[PDB]
Structures are given as C-alpha cells and as structure tokens.
Structure 1
Amino acid sequence: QLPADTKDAKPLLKEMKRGKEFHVIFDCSHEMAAGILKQALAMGMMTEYYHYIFTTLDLFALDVEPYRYSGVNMTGFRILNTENTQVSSIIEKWSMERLQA
C-alpha cells in the first residue's frame, strides 16, 4: 500500500527494489501513477528488468517522454476509443473548449 498523507513513496520503492519485485501492478489514479513513476525513476528501478501494469484507464494521459527510452514495459488499459475519428473529434473539441486548469 502506498503511504498515506503523502505522495513520496521512496521507502516503498526502496523496499520493492530490495525485495527484487520486478513485476508490479499499480492501483492508483493517473496523477498518483505519474507521481509514482517519477519516484521510481528517481529511485533508479525503472529499466528493462521492471514491468509495471497500471489498472488506471488514463494511462494515455501519462507523459512517458522521460520513460520510453528506459526499456521499461509499462502496460495498461484504455477504454477511451481514441482510435475512432468521431471520438478524436470530440476529444479535440473538449480540449479546445476547456481552456481551464
């Protein structure tokens, strides 16, 4: 379980690294998923040895630019049918109309 009252899970990542747990399933929101990805990258346990499955459906919103070249295999799911043209049009319309946060 990720630590409560905080998002800095460095002790948890260090415990998993020390325990040689290479395949991990993450049950957290995409924001906390990004946070834990950054913590793990800072922990140096994000390489081809490690495979992370994310149960969150917002894995497409993740910024994986620092992470693609590492050789990791981050697997997840995406129910948002972005492949469809109408879905892409609706998504772009929502993004343009948002202009918020």
Structure 2
Amino acid sequence: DCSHEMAAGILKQALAMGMMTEYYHYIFTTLDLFALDVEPYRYSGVNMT
C-alpha cells in the first residue's frame, strides 16, 4: 500500500534482492499499476496483481 513511485522503487529493490521469482506474489493497492514499466519483470514469472 503505497504510491506508484514507491511501488517502482520497491520493485527495483526486490529485483535487486532476488525476491522476484515465480515463487512469490504481489498485490498493489495503488490504481496506477498500468503506469509501471513491467518490462524487466515479466519474464521472471512473478505474479503481480
């Protein structure tokens, strides 16, 4: 539950921390998830909703 800018920063940190794989899930309460750049995450198999 944060803004989309904080969501982008958190997703970059989670990619760096190795928590972005098929074994995880992420639900974002923000309404600007379509504004995110999901290009460096879509092949990792994460489940972003």
Scaled to the shorter chain, the TM-score interval is over 0.9
Deviation (angstroms), 1:61 = 0.4
Distance in 2 of aligned mates of 1:64 and 1:34: 9
Normalized against structure 1, the TM-score is what? 0.47
What are structure 1's unaligned runs of at least 5 residues?
1-26, 75-100
Question: Deviation string for 1:53-81 (max 9, x for gaps)?
Answer: 0000000000000000000010xxxxxxx
More helix by share: 1
Aligned length: 49
Question: How much is the aligned-residue C-alpha RMSD, in angstroms?
Answer: 3.9
TM-score by length of 2: 0.96
Structure 1 residue 48 displacement after superposition: 0.5
Amino-acid identity (%): 98
